[model samples]
Structure formats: structure tokens, C-alpha cells
Target chain A: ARPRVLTGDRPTGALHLGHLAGSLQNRVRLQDEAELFVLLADVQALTDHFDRPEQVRENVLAVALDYLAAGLDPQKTTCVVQSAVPELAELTVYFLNLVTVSHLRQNPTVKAEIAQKGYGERVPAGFFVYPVSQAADIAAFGATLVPVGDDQLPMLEQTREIVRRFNALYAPVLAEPQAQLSRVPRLPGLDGQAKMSKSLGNAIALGDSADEVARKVMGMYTDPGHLRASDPGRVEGNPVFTFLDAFDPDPARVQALKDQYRAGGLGDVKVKKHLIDVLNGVLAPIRTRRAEYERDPDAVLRFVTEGTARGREVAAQTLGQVRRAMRLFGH
Target chain B: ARPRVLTGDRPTGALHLGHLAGSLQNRVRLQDEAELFVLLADVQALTDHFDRPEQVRENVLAVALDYLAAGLDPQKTTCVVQSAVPELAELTVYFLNLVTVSHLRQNPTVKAEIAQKGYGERVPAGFFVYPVSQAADIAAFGATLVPVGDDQLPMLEQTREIVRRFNALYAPVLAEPQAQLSRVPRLPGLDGQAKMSKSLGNAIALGDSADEVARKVMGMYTDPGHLRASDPGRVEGNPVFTFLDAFDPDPARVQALKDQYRAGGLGDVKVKKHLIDVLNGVLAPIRTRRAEYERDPDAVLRFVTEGTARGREVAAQTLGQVRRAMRLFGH
Candidate 1:
């Protein structure tokens, strides 16, 4: 049997190019090497989107579409809506007993995210405990490996801590999950920000139309001093070259273009047009598949329903063992 | 439709005379005036008995037997095993999101119980969060009134706080529950302690045999100075008289006995014998019914199972509304 891997995305809205470049592509590849489970974490999403639940609900299918379009084979991966399992929520409640509020507040990833979201004083209690819920989600499926970015390593460490504590305090039943750091570096936003984020309004969604993609690329941010075709441009800090370097297949030609741009003769618009061509080339097949899947919404729903049912069976079994270990089996 | 009232004892052990006097008797009477839901709170029992689940499981049935023997009409009252209704656990998780750690720490009932149990700092998180779980239990049924002793009013207040927070933050879906203060005062232990408790080994179980009851009554603690037959006994602070006051129905006769005991001629043994006679007379029908129910264990299980199924329907309906209020409703 292959090792199980669990990953999830909060259904805040649609998946963007940042998700595709950073994690979605890796998930597609990992399905062949391991048993993969993808979760639409709507319950966790409610920690931040509690007041805007309609957005979360509407985006459930949108996230699923992105997963399918990203080449996550349903036959190899189990895709579930987080709240649909119900057992995940049940397991989370149990896991909460093993963790402390102070422990969660000290987590680097959670603290940084809270700071980024400007929830300094009024952070919701649920938001603080979201990592424990993530631990439950991973441990509930017996997941042994989680693919995450370097920024998410602390979150994975927190999951491992919970698994170790639970196994030691109760019985040695839960497997400690290890983090699989992505080889791909962080993808910068179109606005030249350090990160691509939905809240920043700088994300290229997976479902963007061809015209939308062209328009976004045309307005892409670059070095301010590089004004005309003859002015020297910065290659190292520019987002257009970064996007191309991460997504473009022909590295040699893309490097040549980057060298010419930095050499001070190539204009930023000329380089941006080349970057647009590269982005469209990468997203065209994904867009085609998404369109095909969107035509049959019921089929998409059935896919998630079937996958969630299968995923829940495994989660329920894991929860049974956890309960037995904790001496919580009362029925 | 009568207002619903939900209340019960944690099934950590067999129900005793203290349970009968404290709340079980009121539950029997409220069955007619309110839609009663009696919970065999196995999940709540796990908060304290997490390492001793078998004890909780055994007590679940024992509590059901006690409920039946105490004349709680199953036709009018829905008896449920808490673990059998996972929705209660799920509701608790949602309620936890709305409550803070400081809020839970400030619960007077939890604080008093923790102090009484001597678990000052080493208290388990589950034990600490039991107030939140209690809130879930109350809100899960939309219970409008909870019967409790005066000391437990703080727990009902916590429940009302959670209900108001959930309603204001989500939707006005949950009804705030009120405390129905019991008319009965706290019962004393067989050792004449301030309270009758199972851990103190100073309780009389409802299913005690006639000989057992006689032995306990003979061993009942009285005024320390009432040594000889002609010695005067003070009935004011005497536990024996207190038992008579709570259990003996003929008020004039019991008062006459109290006067004789205080008149310096009634020996402690003679008064104890009369108290034993009164107890046996009161317990005869209950013991007979308990014996019949205990003999047909399968029928008892069936009755509890059916009642649990009925209780689940109401819990499930309440949870549906709770989910909708929390914006966790997803297919």
C-alpha cells in the first residue's frame, strides 16, 4: 500500500494561478506516488469567512473544478468537502483537548497569518484553533506525508506535535505526518508583491478567460525606472520574469528574453507580451478541461460526493481507532 | 407543544440516592409538565473519565435502569445515550468556536467542581471545556429550561451566554435556556458529610437490597455527643433527621419523631430503625420495578435504544438549525 497524503484548500473563492504554480501541480503528481486526499475545507474557511458563508458555499464547486482541471485524477485521489465528512469536525473536537490556546497562539504560521490579516486584538477563537483542526484532518485519514511550502512547515510541525501527543497520551495509534517541502519557490503576485493573495486583488484565477488573462498581464507591475524600450530593466526583482521562470517550459528561450530585457534594449511591454503567451500556453489545456467539467455540473458534484464518501470511510476508521486509543469508545 | 427541558447525570457510575434526590425525582415530575429529554451523558462522562471508558459504558445502562426505577415515564421522556448522538459532539465543536478559553475558565460551576476534585492545575482540557459541551447539550435540543440546583446556576448561565452569542453572531435560531431551580436542598452523605458522593463511598444506590439499606441506615452518622439511650440528640443539624425530612411523606409523624429524639430519651439506634422502616416502605415499589427491569435486560436495552432513536431525531433537527445558524450547512 502507498503512503497516504492529505491536503486541503479553504474554499474562500476560486483557485488562482498562485495555487496552480505552488501546490496544485504537485498534488497532481503526488497522486501517482501516494494515496492523495484533497479537502474543500469549508468549516475551516468559516474561521475567517464566518460572516460570508455564501462565498464559501459558492466556491466549493469552483475549487473542485480547479482540482479536476489541474489533473488530480479522481481514480487516484479522494476529494472531499471537509464538513461533509462530519467525522473530521468530531475528530477536531477531540484533538482540541490535547492542545492549548497558548500553544496555538505561539505558532509562527498562524501568528504571521493573523498579523497579515490585521486581526491583532479581535482574532476569533476558531481562527486560533484552526491548526488543531488541520491536524485532525490529516490524522483522521492516516496521512503520513503533507506537501507544503516552507512557510507551512510550522503548521505541519504542529500537526506532528498533536499526533505525537495523542499517541503518547492515549495509545500509539496515530502516525506522525512529515512535511514534503515543495521544490518550486514562492510565486510572486502580478503586482510584484512578495506573495500572491486573493485579499490583495492580485491573483490570476484558474478560471480566468483568455481576454481577462491578457488584460491582467498587460497591467502587470515591473521596475519603475525601466520606462522605455531603451531603459535597463531589473530581472531579479521583476514579477513578469518570475512568473515566466516558474511556468514557462522552454527555459533557454525565456532566459534569453530575460537577458535581453536586462541588457536595456527590450521594452517591458514586449517582455510582458511574451510572458502572456507563456501563461496562456500553460493555462489553455486547464481552461479547456474546466469548461468541459463545468458543462456537467451534476457530474462534478457526483465526483466530489463519491470521493467524499470514500474519504469519510477511511476517516471514520481512523477516528474509531483514535477513540479506542483514548478510551472514548462508549457505544 | 410543551416547553422542552433537557437534563441528566453523567453516567460515570451507578445512580445513587443523591442523584435521586438532586435531579432524578424532578425529572420524573417534569415529564408531564414539559417535553423531557434525559441524557445518559457518556460523552460528558468522558471529560472526567477519559481513561476509564468502560466505567462510563457500564454506567450508561445503570443510569437507564435508575431512570426507569425512579418513575421517569419513557412515554413522556426521551432517554438518550449521549455518545450515540454524534450531533451533540459536533454542536459542541461549533459552540467552542464562539467561546474563549478565559470564558470557560471563569465558569463558576466548573471552577467549584475542579476545586472539589483537587485538579487545580493538572486539569484535563476536556474537563475544563465541559461547560461548553453542556452548552451544546442544552442548545442542541433547543431546551428552554434546565432543572438544576442553585450551585449549578452558573452552568445554565454559561449556556445562555453561548446561545445569545451564537444567535447574535449567526442567526437568532437558538432559544436561551433558563435554570429551573430545584425545590429540594442538597442531600447529605451516609457519613453525614455536606454532600452525598460516589467517590466518597458515602452514597446509597437506588438498587440497594433491603439488608444493604438496613446496614447503611444502622451505620448512619448522628450527633457525636448522643452516646447513650437517655442522652438528648440534636435533630437540627442531624443527617438522620434530614433524610427523614426529605424521604418520609408523613410530615406530622416525622416531626413527632424529631421531637422525641430531641427530648433526651430516644436513642440513635431506635430512631435509625424507624428511619430504615420509612426508607424501605418508600423504596419497595421502586426496587420491585428495578428488579423486573434488571431481569429483562434485553427489554431494557430495547427500550433505551428506541428512546435514543427518538431522541436522535430531535437532536438531529436541532443540529440542522444550528448548522444553518453557524453557516456550516453544506451537502
Candidate 2:
């Protein structure tokens, strides 16, 4: 079998440039080399968006639209809705028994998010146990490869532990997933924050209109100390250069512009215009693809529906072997 | 709808007289009065019996046999295997979000069991979060009445809280189960232990043969002070009289035996002999019914297969409403 790869996004909002820079682009690249599974993690989204399920519900499609728009070929990659597969939920219930509550609490990723989310003692059981759930999602597909950020290494480690423990206790049915750690640098938010997040309101959505993209680019945070356009500007921490570095194809031109800006003669407007053109060049094809999907949204639904059906077949096959290995009845 | 009643046992072993005196007898009686659902909780059994899945798997049929032999008419009571209904697992995943880890920690029942099981910090996440899973089982069937002892009142209260939170947060579709607290006195083990547990190696199984029952009866623990056949014996705190009190039909005959033993010259053998007769009368019918099912185990399996299908239908209906109320897509 080909190296099965699992990657997903919580359908809390549309995919943004941050998502593209983060993992979605790698998923697109992997479609030809690996068996790709792109999960619409609406169930995981409910951990925080429990009260706003309508947002999670609607954004499942929004995120799928973004995936389709960003050139994820439906034929090459499997796009699955998390909640549509109950086998994952069933596997989660059994996998929970293999993990200790303290182990979940000790997971650095969950601990960090718990503190960041400020759930404290009020953290939902679902959220507290989501790492195990993630393990279930990985194991359900028997994915041998998982594309995730270094921050999610702990989550992948948790999955590996569950696979080892499950196979040791039951049988060697589940495949341990190896992390495909991305070499790409993270894209920062327009506000110069270290992270670009939709919830932080600093992300430029993949589906943003050209005008909105231009407006956001012009307003992007740059060298604050350079009061006059002619004054020397710091390109080291400026977001315009970061965006240009991420999107712009011409490295020589970017380096020349960087040296010019540092030489005290470049204007913010002129540099901003060049960055906007670079961003549009990257987003134009995506916008065109999105328009096609937007014209017949049902076609996108058909993609998810068919992908989910195919995903369930694979998941059910894995669950059957899991049930048999564990000696659960009706296997 | 008739008052829906949900009751079950962990399929750890064959149920004994303790189970009969504890809840099985009440379930038999409720079969005619309510819509009874007898869950063979093989999935929940895995919380602690994760490694011994064969034990859990085989005993699902063992428990269903006990129910059938105990006069739980297959027509009146739905005897569903817990693992067979994936909808329950799906509901459990959603219900976990409505509960907090702190809330599950505060649950007196789970807390007590966690200590008694000596898990300490090693308690499985499944075991720790079972109250929420239990809430899912109750809510899945739309069970309006849950049959539990006073010790399990906390578990019922946990279910009630989840129901209220789910309804308040989503929609008023889930029914909160009320506890039908049993008033019957608990039967003690043959060794005069307070609780008759099979794991303790003292209790008589309902399926025990007549000779086994006789041997256990003869070895019953009474007041250690009674040295000879003519010596006076104390009826209070004596297990023989307790067995007689639970099984013997005639109140006057039992009272006469109690008074004779208290007054002296009654002898332990005489009382033991009388108690054995009373127990045999009870076990004989269960043995006959069990033998019938034992002849064709497939018939018993068919019962579970059919019952589980019926259970899934009901559970799926409730989950559909739950999914809709939660605004989940594809509802």
C-alpha cells in the first residue's frame, strides 16, 4: 500500500494564507506521492465551538471550498467529514480505555491549549480527551503518515503510544503514524503577531476578494520607527517582506527590494503595491476555482459525500480488524 | 410512550444471587410494567477489562442468558449488547462535550470506584469519563426511569446534569432520567460478607448446580459461638437466616426457625438444610430455563442480534434529534 497520509483542519472558519503556509499546500503536494486524507474536523471543532455549532456546521463547507479552491484535486485526495464517520467515534471509546487520564493531562499540547483556552477545571471532557480522539482518527484510517506542525508533535506521540499499547494489549492491527514535520516557516499575522490565526482576526482568507486582499495588504504592519517614506526601514521584522518572502517567486528581486528599503530610499506604498501584486498572482487561480465551486455548491457537497463514503469504507475495514484483534463480538 | 426503563450489568461474569437480589429481580418485574432495555454493557466493561476483552465478549451472551433465564421475556424486554449499537458510542462522543473533567472527577460514584479499584492517577480515561458515557446510554434510549441503587444515585445525577446541559445548550429534546431507587435489602455472600460479589469468590451463581448449592450452604458462616448441635446460635448477623430471609417464602416458618435457633438446640445443620431447600426451589426454574437456551446458544445470539437492531433504531432516532438540535449537518 502507498504511504497513507492524514491531515485535517478544524472547520471553525475558512482556510487562510496561514493555513496554506501551515499545512494545506503540503497536503496538495502529497496528493500525488501519498494516499492523502483531508479531514473536515467538525467534531474536533465542537471542543471550543460547542455553543456555536452552526458556525462549525457551516464552515465545514467553507473549509472544503477553500480546500477545493486551493487546488486539492478531489480525485487525488479524499476529503472526509469527521462527524460523518461513526467508526472513528467507536474507536475513540475503546482507545480511551488504553490511556490514563493523567497521561492526557500530562500531554504538553493539551496542557498548553488548556492554559491558553483558560478552561482550567472547566475543560470539557471531550476537549481534555481529544488527543486520544485524534489517535482514533489516525488509527481508523491506518494512516502511516501524518502531516502536522512541530507544535503537534505531542499529539502524534500520544497516537503512537496508543497504537503501541493497543497492539501490545490486543493485536498488531493499528499502524503507528510518523509525523511529516513541515520545513516551511510559519506565516505570521498581518498584525506582526507570531501566529496567523482566524480567531485572532489577523488572517487573510483564501477566499478574500482582490480588493479585500489589497486593502489588508496596504494596512499591513510595517517598520513603525521609519516615520518618513525616505527614512531607512527595518526589513527584518516587517510583515510586508515576510508576506513577500512567503508568496513572491523572484528571490533576487525580493533581496534587491530588501537592500533598497534598508538603504533609506524605499517608500511603504510602493513596496506595499508590489506585495499586493505578488499576493494576487498567488490567489487569482484560487479565486477562479472558488467561483466555479460557488456556482454549484452541491457539486462540492457531492465531493464530500462521495469522499466520506469512501473514507467510511476504509475506516470500517480498519475497525473490523480492530474489533477482531480485540476479540470484540460480531467481528 | 410507556415509561422507558434502562437497566444493565457489566458482563464481567455470570450474575449471582447478589445480582438477583440487587437488580435483576426488579428488572424481571418491570418487564411487564415498563419498556425495559437490558444492556449487556460489554463496551463499558472494557473501561477496566480492556485487556480481558474475551471475558467481556463471551459474558455478553452469559449476561443475556441470565436475563432470559431470570424471566426477562425476550418480547417484553429488549436485551441489547452495548457494543453492538454504535449510535450509543456516537452519542457518548457528543455528550462528553457537555460534561467537564472536574465534574466527572467530582462524581461521588466514579471517585469512590476509582479509589476502590486502586487506579489512583492511573485510572483509564474511559473509566474516568464513564459517567458521561452512561449518560449517553440513558439518553440514547430516551430512558425516563433508570433503575439504580442508592450508591449509584450520583451516576444518575450525572446523567441528569448532562441531560439538562444538553437540552439547555442545544434543544429540549433529551429526556432526563429519574432514578427508581430499589428498596430491597442486599443479599450477602455465603461467608457473611456485606456484599455478594462474584469477584470475591464467595457468592453463589444463579446457574450453580444443586450439589454446589448444598456444599456452599453447609459451609455457611453462622455465629462462631455455637460449638455443638445443642448450643444456642444467634440469628442476627448470621448468613443462614439471611439467605432464608431472602429466599424462603413462608414468613412464619422462617420466624419459627429463627426463634428455635435463638432459644438453643436448633443446630447449624438443621438451619442450613432448610435454607438449601429454599434456595434450590429458586434455582431449579432458572436452571431449567438456562438449560433450554444452553441447548441452542445460537438462539440466544439471535435474541441479542435482533434486540441490538431494535436498540439501534431507537438510539438513531434520538441521535437524529440530537444532531439536528446541535445543528450538525446531514441530520
Candidate 3:
């Protein structure tokens, strides 16, 4: 069987450099060799951002633009809007019955996020059980490979558990998806946070203008121990070097900069200017494509509409088999 | 607007006399005066009966036959298979985001059910969050009136809260359904439990034969205090009198029996025989119609298929309004 990879982003905002360096770049490459499904998880986004539905709705197209601009061919990768395919929701409800509430509460991933989000006792039920929804997404598409970070391994395990339980109880119609661990290192935020999220206001969006990129880079977090250019700076754990490693393209040039900075001569301004140029160099083509697609909104919208139809058809076929396996009425 | 009533039963088993007296009769009358929807809640039944999908699947037709036999005109009452309409599941996912896990835990009804079911720490998340799904059912139909027992008021209130919250958060697209409290008294089982449920094996099935009804009535729980024929008996809490009250046509004859029972010399056998006669009279025509439909299963199946298509249309229209109100993309 051919490898089918499922990857997605919550449509909370535009795709950022964090997304590009983390997953989008890999998705672009995978589209040529593997069957890829990119989900704009708008419904999942609503679990946390229920109050700002318009934002979630707008970002569906915004993120799709980023996908196309980042060189993901719509002909190769199926872009699915989560809410458009009702079969996924139906699958989620059925999958929920297979999972115990205690299991959801005990999920290491959901547990940390609940504390991080400060939901405490007021956690939305949707947010609490989203791992099962994700399970439904994978099983609905019969996705064989899920690209997940180490942090999301537990979530993938939840899907595996549902698949095992469902197949044991009913029939082996669902495939137990394997985890393809993401090899790319995550890009830290401009402020050196662990994640470069749009909500944290620390991300440089893929569509950022040259001036915006330059301004943000000049203010990027770097070595605090080095008070002046005369003092030697440490490159390890420095976000500037991290960004350079992710975008500069030339390893020898970046290694030379690292050596100079550690040898007490390279100024932050000089490196910041070079990093800005390198980032713009990488982003210029993407920005141009984004601007072109932005002018033709209908074409971008059609990409989602057509892809959603294709994805929905596949999911519907899987759900049909699931219904038969469960002996649902009228099956 | 005319009254649009939504009522349903979980397809857990073949509905019994308890269901007939509980809500089916009211549905029969309401169909003449209002637009009625009878939901065969196969999916809701799956929450607890996930492992018994075949039983749930078979019983969708079993319960529908009971409805038709009890005089529910298919031309007037639209019967919907819950799983057949994916819009309900789609609406349920959205509704789940509006409800908190705490709210579900705090529901007096769900709390009691959770304890009664003895799920402990292993309750299925689907069962815990089913109130939101119930809300989706009511809201999806734009049901103006929901027939519910007094004990189920809290469940109705959950739907109302979702409606209010949804409208406040988005637009006033969903109607907050009002509860039409069921006036018919619940039929007790042969063992005289507070509720007549099939699982408890206490209630008489609508499909029970003459001999079956006779056997069950002979073993019915009456006034245990009146052990012999010579002793006066209490009629108030006796299940025999309750069944008679629900089924016996002549008030004067039943009053005379009650009077004789309050006095000495009315044997339990005499009243038991009379109650059995009265129940069979009510069920005889229902049984005949049920047998006729049972022989022609395809026609009975068409009723659900056509009704589900009709119900799906209404739900889809409401879901469209809900999607637009929330500004869901591609609405």
C-alpha cells in the first residue's frame, strides 16, 4: 500500500514561519511522493476559540493561501475543511463511545493543555474529547501515517486505542495508523519561547512583508550574557542561530557566523541584518505567490471546495464500511 | 407557528406497554394536531449499547412498528432514524463546544444516571456528553415542543441553555424548545418497580401475546398486605389498579371494583383477571396492526426511510441557519 500522511493546523490565524519550518516544508515535499491530506481544523479550533468564530472562519482560506503559496500543489494534496465533511463528525460521535471519560481525562496531552489553558473545571467538553475527534479524522480518512511531534504521540495513541477497540468489537474495517515522528526541529518564537504560535504574538507569518520581517528580526531574542560586540557571545540555545540554521540555506556561512560571534567580534546588528535578508530571500517567492492567490480569491476558494468534496467522498466510503461493521440499521 | 413536537426513544430494545402509555399515545394524538417527529435514536442508544449495535439496529424497526401499531399515522408523524441524518451529529459537535464538562457532570439527571448505570470512573465520554447531543436533536429540528417526563426537565433545560448561548453568541437561528410535560402516568412492571423498563423485565411488551399478557398479569404485584380473599385491600399504590386506571374504559365499573377492594372479600385473582381483560382489549387491535406490518417489513422500513429523508431536510435547513449564524466557511 502507498503511504498516506495526514497533517493539519488549527485555523486560528495565518500560517507562520513556525509552521513552515516545522511541518509545511515537509508537507510540500511529501505531496510529490505520498498521498497527503491537509486539514484546516476549523471545528477543532472552535473548541478553544468558540467566541471568535469569524476569526476561525476567515483563517480557513488564509491558511489555504499559505499552503498554496508554500508550494503545496492542490492536485497532489487534498485540503479538507473539517466542518464541511459531516461524516467526520458522525465518526467522532461513534468513536466517543469506545473511549472512557477517564481515559480522556488521563490523556497526558489533554491534561497539560487543560492546565496550560487554565480551564480547570470549566473545560469545554469538545476540547476535552478532541483526541477522539482527531482519531475520527484519521480513521475516517484511513490515514496510514500521521505526522506528529513527540508531544502529540499520546494523542496518536488514543486513535490507535480506538482502532483496536473498534476492530476487536466489530470488524477490522479501520486501519491502526502508525506514527511517523516529525524529524524537523520546531522553530522557536521570536521571543525564544518553546513554540512560535500566532496566539503568542511571537511568530513571523509566512506572508509577512520585507519591512515587517526586518523589524521583527532586529528585535529578536538573543544572548543576554553578551553586553557588547566586544564580549564573546554563545550561539547554543540562541534563537538567532536557530533561525539561521532553519533558513540561511548555506551551512558553512552560518557556521562561520557562529564562530565569529563566539570569538568576540560579530555584532548582533550585523547578524540580525543578514538573518533578515536570508529570511526574505526564502519568503519572497512565497509572498509573491500569496499576493497572486490573494488577488484570485475565487480560485483559492475552489481549491478548498474541490478538495473537500474529494476528501468527503473518501471519508464517506470509510464510514459506510464502519456502519456495516457495526451492523447499523439501513447499512 | 403551529406546534412542532419532537419525541423519541432509544432503540435499546422492543418498546413495551410502558412506552405506549408513556409517550406513544400522546404522539398519536399530537400527530393529528401538530407536526410530529418520532426519532428512532439508534445512535443515542449506541452510547451505552455500543457493543450491542445489532440489537440496537434491529430494534429501530421494532420500535417503529410499535409506533405505527399504536396508531401513529406516517402521513402526519415523520419518523427519523437518528444516524440517518448526519446533520444532527454535525450540530452535536458544535453544541459540545458550548457546554462545559462541569455542566455535564452537574446535570442532576445525568449525575443520577451515571450513578445508576454504575459506570464509576469508566463512563464513556459519549454517555457523559449526550445531553449536548440531545440539545442538537431538539435544535436541529427547530422543535417548538418536546414531550418529556417531569424527571427529564433538566435534560430539556440543557437544550434551552444551548439555544440561548448559541443565539447570544451568534444569531437567533435556533429555537429554545419548550417542554410539554407528559401527562400519562408511567406503567409499572409486573414486579411493580417505580418505572417499567424492558431491561428490568418488569413491564409487559406491546408485542406480548394473549398468553404472555395473561401470564404477566397473573404474576403482577398487587397489595401485598391483602393476602387472602376475606381481607380488605389498598388500591392506591397497587400496580394492578394503576394499570386498570390507565387502560380500563368504564370509570364506574373500575370505581366499583376499587370500592369492593377497599371493602372485604375482593380477591386479588378477581381484579387481576379483570385488569388482564382490559389490557388485552387495548392491545388486541394494536397487536393485529403490528402483526400486519410485521409480515410486510418492507413497507414499515419505507416509513422510516421516507420519514428520515423528510426529517433530514428539516434538520439540514436548520443546520444551514446555524452554520450561517456562526459564520462557518462555505455556509
Candidate 4:
């Protein structure tokens, strides 16, 4: 049997292109090499979105659909709804006793996320202790590896620290999960920004139709000086070329076009049209499959139900071992 | 059906006379009028006795035996172990999020208990949040009334505050429990200085045999000025009279003995001997039942197991409603 790996995304809203480039693609690949458990982390999403929980509820199925459309094989991976696993909640409470308020406040990843979200002064306590809850999610599944981006390395480290402290304090039952960085390069937004985010309104979703993809690419940000067909353009800082490098399979031809643009000959409209074709080449199959899955909502719900059941079996086994190690086995 | 009442004792050690006078006797009587739930709070016991867990484990059954020996009818009263119901822990985590750290620091009952335990500066986080855990216990059982001592009134009020806050924040599923103060007066220690406690070595246990009862009464403390048999003893500050007033069924005879002692005619030996007889009269049946239960430990364990099962049913029902109110009810 392969080692188990568990990773998840908070179901705040739809998955954008950044998610595909960051960790979701790695999760899809790891399903074949490791026992993968993907979670829709609605409970974690509730930390900051408590007042607007309808948003979390509405996006849960959207995220699951995104996972399926992005090639997360249901046969090779288990996808769970976080709130469905009561054992994970119980494990979080036990882990809370092992960690302190000061330790939670000192977590660097949480601090940065808080700053980025601009919740500096009024951070909720639930938001502060979410790292321990994440630790419970990993330890409950006995996950040996967790797929995380560079920004999430600190979060993974906090989970590992909790695992070490709990094992040392009580018994050696929890496994420390190592982080697996994504092999895919970061894909920037259509506007040539450093990051593609839903909140920033600069993302091409995996579920976007061909027309939607075309419209987004046509408006894509390019080199400012490349206004006329004969003007020289800088392709190095161009986001259109960056997306092409990630999604376009025919790289030699794409590089020839890039060379032509830099040589002060290719027009912006001509290159954007080519980029639109390249994007459609990748997203067409995903869009069709997502539409097929969406037509039969019951079938999709059944798939999620089966995956959650499988996930619970593995998580419950690990939770039983944890209970035994902590001498909480009387029940 | 009668209103349900929830009460519990920390399984730190054996139950002493103070517990009997303060709460145990009231539990026996309250079982007749109300649906009673007596919990052996082993997890709560871990707040102070985490290092000596074996002590808590050993005392769990001992406290159960003490309850039965003290005339708590298991058929009428549901006796459960706290850790047996894991849903209570889950409920506690949600309740913890509703409470503030500053509010916990201001809890007078928790502060006084911390001081009494001498954990002034280095109190464990688990110890600090124990009141929240107790709130879970009470709310999980849907007990409308909670029997507590005067000093614990603030803790019950804190639970009420949590109940009001959760109901106000979410839905109105939780009921605020009213405190049911014990009518029985507190029994002082054999030393007549402070409350009776096992740690103070000043207790008379329910499991004490006739000889042990007589021996403890012989060394009981009295006024220092009553040195001679002819010297008049002060009846107002005497612990012997207090115990007799609470225990002896013959109030007229006890009053006559008190008058004789205050008149300087009754000797200490004679008064102690009569007190011994009164104690034996009350404890003989309890000692017999306790020895029988001790001989058949399996039967006692079976009783506790059955009670725990019953407790889980009630707790699970309340937890189901609590989860539904919190919108965490999928599983």
C-alpha cells in the first residue's frame, strides 16, 4: 500500500487559476502515487465567514465539482466534507489542550493571512486556532504527506510541531506529514498580476466556457509598448506568455511566436487569438465533463457520498489509535 | 415527566463526609422528585490531576461505589462517566468559541477553585477552560436545573451566560439551567477547622466500617478549654453536634445530649460514645451494601456501563439539537 496523503481547500468560493497552479494539480497527480484524501474545509472556512455561512454552503459543491473536473480521480482519491467528520472536531479539542493561545498567535502563516485579509485588530479566536484544527485534519487521517504551497509551509510546520508535541507528551501514534511542493509553476492572472485570485476578479476558472475563456484572454494584459504591429514588445514580463508556457503543449511553436512578438513584428490581437486557442485546447475537455457531471446532480452527490464514507473509514482508524495512545479508550 | 437535574463530582479520590453533607445526600433525595444524572467527571478531574491520571482512573469506580453506598438509587439516577460521551467534548469546542478569554478570567468560581488548588500563576489552559467543559456537560444533557454549592453558583451562571449567548447567536435550542442549592448544611472535618476533605485527612467516608467510624469519632476535635470531663463544652462551635443534627433521626434526644454537655455534666467519652452509636445506626446498612458491592466488582462495573449507555442516549439527543442549531448537522 502507498503512504496516505491528505490535502484540502477552504470552500470560501470557487477555485481560481491560482488554485490549479498552486496545489490542486499536485493533489490530482498524488492520487495515483499515494492514498489521497481531499477535504472540502467548510468548517475551517467558517472561521472568518461565520456571519455569512450561506456562502460556504453554496460553494461546497462548486469546489467538489472543480476537484472532479480538474482530474481528481474518485477511484484513487477520497473527498470528504469537513463538517461530516465529528471525530475530527473531537481531535481538534484534544489538540487545543496541547497548544497555547500564545503559540497560535505566533503562527507566521496565520499572521500573514490575517494581514492580507486586513483583519488586523479584530481577528476572531476561531481564526487564530485554525492551524490546530488543520493539524487534527492531517493527524486524523494519518496523512504522511500534505500538499502545500510556499505560503502554506508555515501552516504545515505548525501541524508538524503539534504532532511532535502530542506524540512526545502522550504516546507515539500520530504521524508527522511532510510538505510536497507543486511541480507546476505559478500562473499569473489575465491582467498580468503576480497572482490570480477570485477576490481580485482576475481569474479564468476551470469551469469557464470557450467563449468566456476567449473574452478573458482577449482582454489579457500585455507589454505596454507593443501597441502597433511593428512595435517591439517584452515577452519576459508578459502574463499571456506565462499562461502559454503552463498550458500550451506545443512550446516550440509558442516560443517562435514569442520571438516574433519581441522582434517588433507580431500584433497583440494575433498573439491573443493564438493564446485563446491554446487556453480552449486545455479547458474544452474539462468544461464538457463538468457539464456532464452537473446534469446528473444525484450522481455527483453519490460520488461525494462514497468518497466521504471511504475517508471516514481511514480517519476513524487513526482516531481510534489516537484514543488508545491517550488512554481515552474506555468508551 | 419531572424536570431533569444534572450534577457531578470530580473523580480525584474517594467521597468524604463533606461531599455527603454538601451534595451527595441531596442527590439521593432529589432522585425521587427529579430525573437525576450523576456524572463521574474524570476528564474534569484531569484539570488538576493530569500528571496522576491513575489516581483519577482508580477513583472513578470508587466514586460510583460511594454513590451507591450513600443510597443513590442507580435505577432512579443515571450515573455516567464524563469521558465516555465524546459528543460532550465536541460540544465544548463550539462553546469555547462563543466565550472570550477575558470573560473566563473573570469567572469567580474558576478563580476561587484555581486559588484553592494553588495554581496561581501557572494554571494549565485545560484547567482554565474547565467551566466551558462543564457547560457542555449540563447543556448536552438538557438539564433544566443544576444542583450546585453556593461557591459554584458563579460557574452555573457562566453556563447560563453561554447558553444565552449561543441561543442568541445561533438558535434558541439550549435552555439556561437554574441552580438548585442544597438544603443540607455543610459538614466540617473531623478536625473541626475547615471543610471535610480526603486530602486533608479529616474525612469520615461512607465506606467506613463501624470500628473505623468509632475510631474517627474518638479523635474528633472539640473546644480546647473543655480539658476536663467536668468542664462545660461550647455547643455552638462543636462539629459533633453539627453531625448529629444532620444525621441523627432522634432530634429530641440529640437536643437533650447537647444541653447536658453544655451544662458541664456530660463527659467527652460519654458524648463521643453516643455519637458513635448514632453514626453506626446511620451507616450500618451503607457499610453492608458497600461490602457486598466491593465483593462483586464486575456487577458494579456492569451497572456503570449500563448507566453510561443511557447517558449517551440523552447526551446524543441534546447534541443533535445543538449541532442542528449551529448548522453543523449534516452527519
Q: Which is the leading candidate under lDDT?
A: 3
- For lDDT, candidate 1 versus 3, the one ahead is 3
Clashing pairs in 3: B189-B202
Per-prediction TM-score: 0.86, 0.95, 0.96, 0.83
Encode model 1's per-residue lDDT on A1-331: one tens digit a residue. Answer: 2989889899888888999888988888899988888989888888777777778888888889889987788688888988778788778767766765556667898889888888765666677778888888999888998998888888899889888878877789999999898757888888999989788999899899988999998899988888898988898888998998888899998989988888988998888888889889989999998999889888788778888899889989998887677665342
Best by TM-score: 3
Give the TM-score, chain B only, in order for the candidates.
0.95, 0.97, 0.97, 0.96
- Between which residue pairs do clashes occur in model 2? none
Please give me the DockQ of candidate 4 compared with the native complex: 0.21
Off by over 4 Å in 1: A100-106, A114-125, A161-176, A224-237, A253-267, A319-331, B114-123, B164-174, B188-195, B209-245, B248-281, B320-331
Task: State the lDDT of candidate 3 residue by residue for B1-331, as single tens digits.
Answer: 2789999999987778888788888788888888999899888999999998889988998889988899987788899999999899999999999989988888888888899999988899899988889999999998999988887889899999989999999999888999888665667777877788988989798889999999999998888778899999988789988888878889899898899899987899999988898989989999999989989989899899999999999999999899999999987
Candidate achieving the largest DockQ: 3
DockQ metric for all predictions: 0.29, 0.79, 0.81, 0.21
Which structure is stronger by DockQ: 2 or 4? 2
Q: Which residue ranges in model 4 land beyond 4 Å of their true spot?
A: A111-126, A151-155, A168-170, A181-205, A208-284, A329-331, B47-50, B115-125, B182-195, B217-278, B329-331
lDDT of each: 0.82, 0.89, 0.90, 0.80
- The clash number for model 2 is 0
User: For model 4, which pairs clash?
Assistant: none
Lowest summed lDDT over 10 consecutive residues: which window, candidate 2 chain B?
B181-190
Q: Determine the iRMS, in angstroms, of model 1.
A: 3.1
For residue A311, give model 1's deviation from the true position in Å: 2.3
